């Protein structure tokens, strides 16, 4: 005897979802504290953040010409030293000045510092996204150098 | 200095969080290289042949 | 624009030094136009050449005589069974039976 | 991710990894020096030169 | 259950089925951004918007590549210069 | 396997244009289902003759590998007659269009 | 008149996208007068024409710069153009086929 | 790390027969291309037959390891 | 049989070692995208340098040489569907011009063949009395010592 | 402080009478209804399309030889029209090749 | 938790101690008509069922051929089209 | 040849089938 | 001494290299939708390209 | 560096690559100064080869 | 037939033809 009169398939769907959620709560309660919180919240959350950031934002590999132009990262923790090739995720509205400040930690940068991509110098009042689209399409490797000349 | 004296462009590190894309990048590489072309058609025929042999053995 | 006798790629063609030839063709042309594909040739049918498609040709047919056979044959497992021990799968997947 | 891939062929009968044919301009012999004199033996059909 | 021969599938599953929520979230975010872009276009714009493009910085004082517009200091009889 | 000579003779009759008129006349008042069933029945009769007569009878070609050698020879004949011929034509085609080995050339370097 | 016509057209545009209006306005707004105009005709197709007093500024043999509408697709015009190009090139080797796939069909494939 | 170990073992056991059929085949092909006389050819025929038997041995070994690596209780 | 196998144990869609599991795995990979053809943005990654593609182009263009049209298809796939304003490097430009030159020579000289253009065919035209001589020795160039 | 967890929190379910197999065995009737209805819909549509076409064909080509003639004529007409279109595109391509030669 | 949504099973060790565990029948027979076949001995199958079964004494190579040709045609000329050059 | 069951009638039938196929192609591309 | 040259290199097919051509390939022929698309655009008065304007 | 005063053809063979890059940069600058862009098409159905692969966003 | 009496469980699972409904449901992505 499939189905009952006066009852709707949508009501049955609600019933089923309630059953599933109650069972999930029971199984989460009767589980190890050591494993369940990690496996249910921290790995999903990290994976979500990473995948969303990669699939949505757009990033750039940043290099610097000379060691004298490297930033001072001695004080901030988990990164005591600059390394070239760092992947850096930015927003579409970011400019070269904002990028430079982000690199140098809101501190006094050196003089006549400029950004290039495939040999092509960027203006500082330029959107990084459009500048890359123009000069280095699908090769976002940026380089920071000193333009004395 | 000038930007062309720089050569070490291929040291493109990437965050350690992105190691979860290991299998995804592998499958994407094998898709672009093997599966979406004639060798992939051969592989599909091989899978169908596995099904054929399983059915034959059952009967 | 600095080393004219040493940069021949950026120089005019020899038909330009000759002083003799509705609309006419241009008199001055560079050798740097050799670095472009569609400089002289037209761009006709540029974006329509990857649209000429041809179908594949493989036929998936093979007769299956089982009357010839009387023994079973081995078969691969393609994926792990997640319908059983689903909750423990990340915890036992690394072991070998 | 912008460089192109070389074709892949691998089977029990034939492959495309025991040799290199080269580019369209810079070509080269797929077979190595010891079996170049016996190229006829690695062919199902052979149409020799005119001389 | 499992076996050494299923290491490929085990790794792929463990690493990819957790990503499916994020993939669906990305798809939903894309649809919402498209909806908002189309609503803006219906409302009206000075310069056009490219729908399937990443970023649209164009305005009265800005080009379609983020630079300032040339010859935009004065006013023109035919209206906008674009 | 059996009746290879009869099969050659059948092909010869099929390629004869007089037999095309004969078949045109025989096709009067006839259905595709009937034709297909007739052909299937013929093939079944051949394979059934094999399955029955192999139990008690041995052909002139009998060998310690049995009919496996005859079937291998059928395959090899088909291969050398059809597939290697097609390979020859494809070889000449590729050699005229790109040069010998043109289909295995590497992509243009970027 | 040119400005008004352009403004009216661009809001209810033509499949030409108002190109003739645009060029008319551009040539009217010149100080000394229009260099390029659209010839008035009883003939069906209109032509672009160049004034004589500015002919020395343009690289032209005559004032007629051709029709103001593109050609219509025609097998005959294509044949004519191809024959003319072949004659001008004068290349012995065109149409030569050193190898053709062996087939009853004249053109295998195409 | 266990997944990587297992896939390495599996792929080696899968390609073992391909190797025995292909690379030793290439070696035999070199020897065939180089040899001309009859005595050496007579002696080399037995090497070819040995390669046949060796290929079947490798195939048996791979069958064993693959039925071990693709056997599931449940 | 397939339907009943689905409700049998260890025989669900692609799980297990049964022929139903194999068939479902085949359908699953078919339903997936991995075996679909690539897009136009991604054709010059593998397909335009493929033996199947090259043989089919040569076959369906009987007496012609499609290297140049293949170069132009690569240019298209990179310019019009991937967004590259500069699709060709110096190498690819040289290859394009090489193929253009070969086309010119093939149409200029009737019957030209390998040493001058990459092309080989068997049915050739010979004079009738073909003389065979030794090449001259390579020209002695002057050298120090 | 003792056991906080029961046994079923750890131990694996029954090997042969498990949760999924019982579930799918319970859902078998609804799935049968669903897929039978879908298959019947598709079959009825295909039959409604195929019956009148077979009737119209057999009415005008009742015999096998006539069916073969009609099939061959269909093939020839298709090939001829394709050849017309191909000839046009070939003329365009020929012009482009001639301009390449001119370059 | 209340206990309404508890686990709908008991562990195999406790069943074994209760004397309740059954191990068998990886497969099942849904309908009683199908269950009682080997016990009836006189009508394992009804007559209608018998004549319906007589239609499947052999597999249909004709249907195999037709379905395979249709699927190959569709898969080749709708799903596996690829571009080709034109000269 | 116009109405009756005959070889010309079958040829006409095949021609009509070809033209209807191409009409269907026209509709497909139009939509 | 360039035209009508002799065969300088050999032509061959290596063992078991594939051909990717079936037996009806000679009857196969190409097709482009471009001519039909042009006719349909002209008949339905769809957006024209600017290449129609000189 | 290649001594084009005495070997101009040999040096041009080395330097035309940088001439080509300059030629490209010229257009990239003109198109940034004069805003030139194009209507990009919607995303392809198989932009990603594999579902688990990351679709790295490019400007 | 009404929406309510169609989506009633008994009529939905016994007398109704749910083929078109479930086919539309499967092909939803195509329509979207
Ligand atoms: C060239 C060979 C290599 C081929 C190419 C390479 C391919 C390699 C792959 C090999 C795979 C083989 C295919 C196996 C499938 C099974 C085939 C099979 O067993 O049945 C075959 C088939 C017999 O079918 P059947 O069902 O057994 O019916 C038997 C009859 O009832 C009759 O009853 P019967 O009792 O009276 O006789 C039974 C049988 C008895 O057959 C035998 O026992 C063998 C005969 C003598 C013993 C030694 C045999 C080897 C050396 C002598 C024969 C040389 C020819 C090689 C024949 C290969 C088979 C052994 O008789 C024959 O079948 C005659 C076969 C010999 C034909 C001789 C033709 C002479 C012209 C050729 C010039 C001379 C040779 C040049 C050098 C070639 C060197 C390679 O034989 C036929 O070909 C039918 C002939 C019909 C007449 C056709 C018109 C005359 C044309 C003659 C040529 C026939 C085609 C073959 C070409 C060979 C000559 C170039
Ligand atoms: C014993 C087994 C039976 C033997 C007979 C089997 C062959 C039957 C056919 C015979 C008739 C062939 C035609 C001859 C006329 C001339 C044309 C021609 O030659 O070209 C074809 C070809 C050359 O091609 P070509 O040079 O490019 O010429 C132009 C093209 O071919 C043509 O121009 P196209 O490229 O534009 O045409 C393309 C397209 C046009 O055609 C089509 O598209 C459709 C064609 C298929 C029609 C489908 C059937 C129609 C069904 C409608 C009804 C359906 C409903 C009812 C049925 C339902 C089904 C149950 O497709 C084709 O044309 C394909 C042609 C197929 C060639 C034959 C393939 C079989 C190769 C030989 C197999 C040997 C088996 C082992 C023998 C073992 C004996 C020891 O030459 C051959 O095929 C050679 C056949 C030689 C027969 C050998 C018989 C064995 C005798 C023993 C000799 C011993 C020495 C052998 C060495 C090894 C011995 C151990
Ligand atoms: C390119 C492939 C594309 C797809 C990917 C492949 C995925 C499938 C892989 C399958 C691999 C299996 C291996 C082949 C099987 C061989 C043995 C066999 O089939 O036995 C004979 C068997 C004959 O059956 P039988 O036992 O004699 O029953 C005859 C009864 O008298 C008939 O009377 P009845 O009462 O049974 O009903 C009459 C009629 C109709 O039924 C009725 O009673 C009326 C109701 C019909 C209306 C609805 C039609 C069905 C749905 C629509 C179908 C078409 C279009 C869909 C459009 C969508 C909506 C618009 O029956 C049928 O239509 C039969 C249904 C055919 C379905 C296939 C069989 C199920 C196999 C499971 C495959 C797994 C797929 C997963 C399922 C999807 C996810 C859940 O063959 C078949 O029927 C199946 C055809 C096989 C498919 C061809 C695939 C090619 C295989 C390649 C093997 C060769 C490998 C190497 C290639 C290289 C060669 C050089
Ligand atoms: C030891 C290992 C064990 C473990 C196995 C592990 C493997 C598991 C995985 C499975 C394997 C996957 C591997 C990867 C696959 C990728 C490689 C690949 O596919 O391509 C390679 C390979 C590469 O070729 P390609 O150069 O790249 O060209 C590719 C083309 O696309 C395709 O080439 P194509 O199109 O040029 O060749 C097709 C060929 C063959 O095409 C066909 O046969 C189509 C299929 C029809 C089969 C059903 C008909 C059977 C008829 C039998 C009746 C004979 C009479 C009875 C006599 C009895 C006495 C003997 O065409 C012809 O020769 C001409 C025939 C034209 C007519 C055919 C149509 C009419 C049919 C009706 C006949 C009526 C004739 C009337 C004549 C006219 C009179 C008016 O592809 C092929 O060669 C395809 C043909 C291969 C045939 C192999 C021959 C052996 C077949 C038996 C296999 C074993 C049987 C097992 C037992 C079951 C049978 C008892
Ligand atoms: C869309 C692509 C689907 C392809 C893959 C899936 C296979 C295709 C076949 C369809 C899948 C669904 C089959 C459902 C079978 C269950 C039928 C049944 O009666 O179950 C008992 C339920 C509960 O019934 P009940 O308990 O209330 O009353 C009846 C009680 N008995 C059984 C004792 C008589 O029946 C229903 O009420 C209808 C449920 C089926 C309709 C829901 C379909 C589920 C699929 C979507 C999953 C997500 C749910 C949330 C959706 C939210 C919507 C906003
Ligand atoms: C083509 C696709 C084919 C593949 C199919 C794809 C779909 C199916 C794929 C599933 C395969 C992987 C499934 C593994 C699931 C692992 C998750 C897991 O079990 O967690 C580990 C925990 C660990 O439990 P444990 O550590 O005590 O025991 C686990 C196993 N042993 C004993 C061996 C260690 O398991 C649980 O008990 C919880 C699971 C149920 C809860 C699921 C998460 C949702 C929670 C929602 C409720 C939150 C309540 C918050 C209230 C807070 C206040 C208290
Ligand atoms: C709650 C919101 C809706 C939930 C449903 C989510 C499912 C969406 C997945 C469908 C597949 C999307 O895959 C792809 O994404 C978006 C539309 O989404 C489109 O992408 C394209 O159009 C959208 C417009 O919306 C643009 O924002 C985008 O710049 C462009 O690339 C592609 O044409 C589509 O192929
Ligand atoms: C006799 C009628 C029987 C019914 C058959 C009806 C089946 C209809 C299903 C059509 C679905 C095909 O799906 C479609 O396949 C083609 C490949 O051929 C793909 O085509 C893709 O690759 C090709 C080649 O590079 C290009 O045209 C383009 O990049 C892209 O469209 C499409 O991305 C995909 O959407
Ligand atoms: C005689 C009867 C004739 C019946 C004719 C039936 C007409 C059927 C026409 C269907 C054509 C749909 O064509 C296909 O649809 C999808 C969306 O649905 C389009 O859209 C798809 O591809 C493009 C990019 O490649 C993007 O929009 C997006 O990534 C994706 O949604 C495809 O670009 C198009 O190729």
């Amino acid at each position: 005897p499939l189905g009952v009169k006066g009852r709707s398939v949508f009501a049955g769907m609600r019933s089923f979802i309630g059953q599933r959620l109650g069972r999930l709560y029971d199984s989460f309660y009767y589980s190890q504290s050591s494993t369940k919180y990690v496996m249910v919240f921290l790995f999903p959350a990290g994976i979500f953040y990473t995948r969303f950031r990669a699939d949505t934002k757009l990033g750039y590999h940043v290099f610097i010409n000379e060691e004298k132009l490297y930033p001072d990262y001695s004080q901030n923790y988990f990164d005591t030293k600059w390394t070239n090739g760092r992947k850096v995720y930015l927003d579409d509205e970011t400019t070269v000045e904002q990028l430079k400040a982000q690199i140098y930690g809101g501190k006094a940068a050196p003089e006549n510092v400029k950004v290039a991509c495939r040999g092509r110098v960027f203006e500082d009042a330029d959107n990084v996204a459009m500048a890359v689209r123009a000069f280095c399409k699908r090769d976002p490797r940026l380089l920071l150098f000193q333009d004395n000349l | 200095a000038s930007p062309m004296l720089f050569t070490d462009y291929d040291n493109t590190a990437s965050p350690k969080s992105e190691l979860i894309f290991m299998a995804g990048n592998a499958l994407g590489y094998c898709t672009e290289r093997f599966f979406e072309n004639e060798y992939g058609q051969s592989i599909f025929m091989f899978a169908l042949g596995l099904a054929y042999l399983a059915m034959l053995g059952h009967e | 624009p600095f080393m004219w006798r040493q940069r021949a790629y950026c120089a005019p063609v020899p038909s330009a030094f000759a002083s003799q030839q509705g609309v006419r063709k241009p008199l001055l042309r560079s050798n740097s136009e050799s670095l472009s594909v569609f400089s002289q040739i037209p761009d006709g049918l540029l974006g329509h050449t990857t649209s000429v498609t041809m179908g594949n040709s493989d036929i998936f047919f093979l007769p299956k005589p089982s009357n010839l056979l009387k023994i079973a044959l081995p078969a691969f497992v393609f994926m792990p069974n997640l319908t059983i021990f689903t909750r423990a799968f990340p915890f036992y997947a690394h072991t070998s039976a | 991710h912008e460089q192109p891939y070389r074709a892949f062929s691998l089977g029990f009968t034939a492959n495309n990894l025991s040799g290199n044919w080269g580019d369209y301009i810079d070509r080269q012999d797929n077979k190595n020096a010891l079996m170049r004199p016996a190229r006829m033996m690695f062919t199902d059909v052979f149409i020799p030169t005119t001389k | 259950s499992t076996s050494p021969g299923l290491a490929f599938a085990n790794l792929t599953l463990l690493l990819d089925v957790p990503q499916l929520p994020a993939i669906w979230a990305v798809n939903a975010w894309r649809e919402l951004n498209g909806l908002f872009t189309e609503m803006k276009t219906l409302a009206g714009t000075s310069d056009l918007l490219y729908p399937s493009n990443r970023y649209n910085p164009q305005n009265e004082k800005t080009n379609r590549m983020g630079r300032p517009r040339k010859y935009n200091h004065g006013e023109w009889m035919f209206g906008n210069s674009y | 396997g059996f009746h290879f000579q009869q099969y050659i003779a059948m092909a010869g009759r099929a390629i004869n244009p007089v037999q095309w008129t004969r078949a045109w006349r025989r096709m009067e008042g006839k259905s595709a289902t009937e034709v297909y069933r007739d052909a299937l029945a013929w093939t079944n009769n051949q394979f059934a003759q094999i399955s029955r007569a192999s139990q008690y009878r041995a052909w002139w070609w009998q060998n310690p590998l049995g009919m496996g050698l005859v079937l291998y020879g059928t395959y090899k004949a088909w291969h050398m007659i059809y597939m290697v011929r097609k390979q020859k034509k494809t070889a000449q085609l590729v050699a005229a269009a790109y040069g010998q080995g043109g289909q295995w050339l590497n992509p243009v370097p970027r | 008149d040119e400005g008004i016509n352009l403004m009216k057209c661009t809001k209810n545009p033509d499949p030409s996208f108002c190109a003739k209006e645009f060029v008319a306005m551009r040539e009217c707004n010149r100080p000394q007068g229009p260099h390029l105009v659209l010839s008035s005709s009883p003939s069906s197709p209109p032509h672009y024409e160049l004034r004589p007093e500015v002919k020395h500024l343009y690289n032209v043999d005559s004032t007629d710069l051709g029709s103001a509408v593109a050609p219509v697709r025609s097998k005959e015009q294509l044949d004519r153009v191809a024959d003319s190009l072949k004659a001008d090139l004068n290349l012995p080797g065109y149409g030569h086929i050193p190898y053709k796939w062996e087939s009853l069909r004249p053109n295998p494939g195409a | 790390r266990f997944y990587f170990m297992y896939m390495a073992r599996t792929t080696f056991q899968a390609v073992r027969p391909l190797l025995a059929f292909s690379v030793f085949g290439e070696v035999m092909k070199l020897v065939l291309a180089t040899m001309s006389s009859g005595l050496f050819s007579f002696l080399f025929s037995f090497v070819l037959a040995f390669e046949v038997f060796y290929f079947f041995l490798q195939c048996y070994i791979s069958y064993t390891f693959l039925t071990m690596f693709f056997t599931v209780l449940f | 049989q397939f339907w009943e196998a689905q409700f049998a144990n260890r025989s669900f869609f692609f799980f297990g070692n049964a022929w139903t599991s194999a068939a479902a795995f085949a359908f699953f990979i078919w339903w997936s995208r991995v075996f679909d053809p690539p897009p136009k943005e991604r054709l010059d990654r593998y397909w335009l340098n493929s033996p199947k593609f090259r043989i089919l182009s040569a076959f369906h263009n009987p007496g012609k040489r499609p290297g140049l049209k293949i170069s132009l298809m690569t240019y298209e796939a990179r310019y019009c569907y991937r967004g590259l304003d500069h699709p060709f490097t110096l190498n690819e430009m040289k290859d394009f011009l090489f193929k253009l030159r070969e086309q010119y020579l093939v149409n200029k000289y009737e019957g030209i063949q390998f040493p001058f253009v990459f092309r080989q065919f068997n049915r050739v035209s010979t004079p009738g009395t073909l003389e065979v001589h030794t090449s001259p020795a390579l020209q002695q160039q002057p050298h120090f010592h | 402080f003792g056991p906080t967890l029961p046994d079923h929190a750890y131990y694996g379910e029954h090997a042969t009478y498990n949760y999924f197999v019982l579930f799918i065995r319970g859902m078998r009737p609804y799935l049968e209804k669903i897929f039978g209805d879908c298959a019947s819909t598709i079959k009825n549509a295909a039959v409604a399309v195929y019956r009148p076409v077979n009737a119209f064909v057999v009415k005008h080509n009742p015999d096998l030889r006539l069916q073969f003639v009609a099939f061959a004529s269909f093939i020839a007409t298709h090939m001829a029209i394709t050849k017309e279109f191909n000839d046009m595109y070939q003329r365009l391509v020929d012009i482009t090749s001639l301009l390449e030669l001119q370059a | 938790p209340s206990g309404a949504y508890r686990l709908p099973a008991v562990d195999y060790k406790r069943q074994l101690s209760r004397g309740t565990l059954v191990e068998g029948a990886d497969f099942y027979l849904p309908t009683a008509q199908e269950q009682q076949r080997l016990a009836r001995h006189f009508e394992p199958y009804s007559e209608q069922e018998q004549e319906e079964r007589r239609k499947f004494r052999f597999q249909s190579i004709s249907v195999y051929l037709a379905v395979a040709l249709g699927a190959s045609f569709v898969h080749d000329y709708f799903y596996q089209r690829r571009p080709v050059a034109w000269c | 040849a116009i109405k009756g069951p005959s070889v010309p009638h079958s040829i006409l039938f095949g021609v009509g089938a070809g033209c209807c196929a191409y009409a269907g192609y026209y509709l497909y591309r139009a939509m | 001494s360039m035209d009508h040259g002799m065969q300088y290199s050999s032509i061959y097919w290596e063992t078991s290299h594939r051909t990717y051509l079936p037996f009806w390939a000679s009857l196969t022929q190409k097709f482009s939708w471009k001519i039909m698309d042009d006719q349909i655009r002209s008949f339905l008065r769809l957006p024209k390209p600017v290449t129609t304007e000189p | 560096s290649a001594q084009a005063r005495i070997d101009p053809q040999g040096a041009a063979t080395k330097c035309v690559k940088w001439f080509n890059e300059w030629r490209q940069c010229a257009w990239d600058q003109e198109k940034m100064v004069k805003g030139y862009n194009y209507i990009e098409d919607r995303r392809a159905r198989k932009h990603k080869p594999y579902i688990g692969a990351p679709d790295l966003q490019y400007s | 037939v009404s929406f309510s009496q169609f989506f009633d469980s008994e009529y939905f699972w016994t007398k109704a033809n749910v083929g078109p409904f479930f086919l539309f449901l499967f092909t939803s992505p195509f329509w979207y």
Side-chain angles (χ1 to χ4, degrees), chain F residues 83 86-87 90, chain G residues 101, chain I residues 55-56, chain M residues 13 17-21:
Chain F
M83 183 55 67
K86 187 166 63 152
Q87 285 171 355
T90 313
Chain G
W101 184 278
Chain I
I55 288 161
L56 264 70
Chain M
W13 198 259
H17 278 188
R18 274 194 78 179
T19 291
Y20 306 107
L21 300 168

Side-chain angles (χ1 to χ4, degrees), chain B residues 32-33 35-38 40, chain I residues 34-36 42 45-46 50:
Chain B
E32 289 186 61
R33 189 100 200 269
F35 302 154
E36 71 189 7
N37 307 116
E38 54 265 32
Chain I
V34 294
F35 290 109
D36 297 353
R42 213 196 303 151
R45 201 80 191 276
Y46 193 99
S50 178

